[PDB]
Amino acid sequence: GVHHYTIDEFNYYYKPDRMTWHVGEKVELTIDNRSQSAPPIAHQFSIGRTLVSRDNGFPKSQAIAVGWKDNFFDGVPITSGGQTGPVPAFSVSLNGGQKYTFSFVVPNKPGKWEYGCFLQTGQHFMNGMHGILDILPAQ
Ligand SMILES: [Cu+]
């Protein structure tokens, strides 16, 4: 069967902030921007490894997140409504009140991955907008 997952976006966190999938699992994932502010703000959902932060040669208490070096969805074919196929640099960016539902098969990329939002120059990420995805080997 296809397993349905939802990740809700709020300022500035995901619910849930942990998720576990198995290699080979059929996933239908809905990302929903439930931004609660006046006005509601855009949010990103990107899954990857190896945090990249701003350079400037001076030390920081919090690094200003800018992206992931390794994108979990690299190579991964996805279906969303009428469209099927891999999506280059796949990321989900949504305005407040918008959602996006897509399906795929979990690739053989076992271990720990992270999800995050890099909008507003890393400020959301700094405010806690990140989560952990564990990928288990096939049952
Ligand atoms: Cu965000």
Q: How many CB atoms lie within 10 A of CB 101?
A: 14
Q: Which residues are annotated as a binding site?
A: 43, 117, 124, 129
Experimental method: X-ray
Q: Which residues are annotated as a binding site for Cu(2+)?
A: 43, 117, 124, 129
**Which domains are assigned to the chain?**
3-136 (2.60.40.420)
Please report the resolution in angstroms: 1.6
Q: Cα–Cα distance between 117 and 114 in angstroms, integer?
A: 10
- Give me the residues near ligand 1 (ion), CB cutoff below 5 Å: 43, 117, 119, 124, 129
Residue 116 C-alpha to ligand 1 middle, in angstroms? 8
